[PDB]
Ligand binder design. Sequence first.
Ligand code: HEM
Ligand SMILES: COc1cc(/C=C/C(=O)O)ccc1O
Ligand SMILES: COc1cc(/C=C/C(=O)O)ccc1O
Ligand SMILES: [Ca+2]
Ligand SMILES: [Ca+2]
Length: 306
Amino acid sequence: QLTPTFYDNSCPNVSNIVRDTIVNELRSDPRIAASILRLHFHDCFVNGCDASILLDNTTSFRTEKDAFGNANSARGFPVIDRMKAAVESACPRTVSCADLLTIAAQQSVTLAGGPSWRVPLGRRDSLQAFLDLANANLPAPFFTLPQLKDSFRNVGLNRSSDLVALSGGHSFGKNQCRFIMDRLYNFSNTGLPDPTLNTTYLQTLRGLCPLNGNLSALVDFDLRTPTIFDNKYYVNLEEQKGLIQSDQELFSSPNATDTIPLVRSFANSTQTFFNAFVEAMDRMGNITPLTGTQGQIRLNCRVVNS
Ligand code: HEM
Ligand SMILES: COc1cc(/C=C/C(=O)O)ccc1O
Ligand SMILES: COc1cc(/C=C/C(=O)O)ccc1O
Ligand SMILES: [Ca+2]
Ligand SMILES: [Ca+2]
């Protein structure tokens, strides 16, 4: 069983080292906190939270970094190496990359103004990466609500509260024009913009993402508080101002009978959202972990030991 006190004896300062590393990085890159949370998410949705996503290419297996969901998207890997090196110096061969990334995600959320809690620990590192599993498991921004739900259930999260609460991760962070071009100019081959996108916001987004423009240009997930982790992400949905398709569907989809009340619940109370996010976060963090003697304590998160 995973436990929050796993390193209280072997490395009582792991959480502190991780925090300081993020605090320093945030001064030169205010997007790092969001990037790190996403890395933990993409790690857990592929064979569980086993740091498989941090592994680089080998002649035997391809890195998950080249998955459609990570390629020219996932970021912050060097920052993870920095906190890892620091932790290894403070406590040699003690903290796994999988646990490190979990703590890093929790600290990122807290540093961004989100809830604060102690994540369960005791996960160990994988001996391989799963590129194909990543392309199949990572949900896409153009997914319908049914697909989004299927995606979460596929990894072990059956609750709609998991999807709605974890989707709150979009209360900060950036998104490329590339993933909303369809919503702005030609949604589902209708030749028209997505009707579930507020017309006034549509205009704003079209200005940031003109047709035939830079598809790599970055746009904020939350027009209200772009870098602050809060429940404003849900208020946007209620106003049809969710950035990507997968966001707005939680409130506009014909299959959203169960997600709508959850969206409103989180939008009405920060405490309600924070509690659900913590609960959902720990559930995601409990997806098929390697524990005990399974897997290893990777010294360099990029490669398997020795
Ligand atoms: C429900 C399905 C989800 C889909 C379809 C989805 C899709 C995406 C997309 C398209 C981006 C933009 C990537 C880019 O432009 O390169 C992104 C970024 C992000 N996502 Fe999600 N996401 C989902 C769930 C989540 C979850 C569960 C979390 C974490 C709890 C999360 C946290 C983030 C963060 C923080 C960013 C911004 C990262 C950065 O700015 O570096 N996402 N996601
Ligand atoms: C970067 O932040 C920290 C680093 C350490 C390192 C200890 C060691 O190397 O023994 C301890 C506490 C910290 O908050
Ligand atoms: C950029 O982020 C994502 C992209 C995809 C898929 C892209 C594609 O199939 O072209 C899936 C999940 C993601 O989180
Ligand atoms: Ca993984
Ligand atoms: Ca916000």
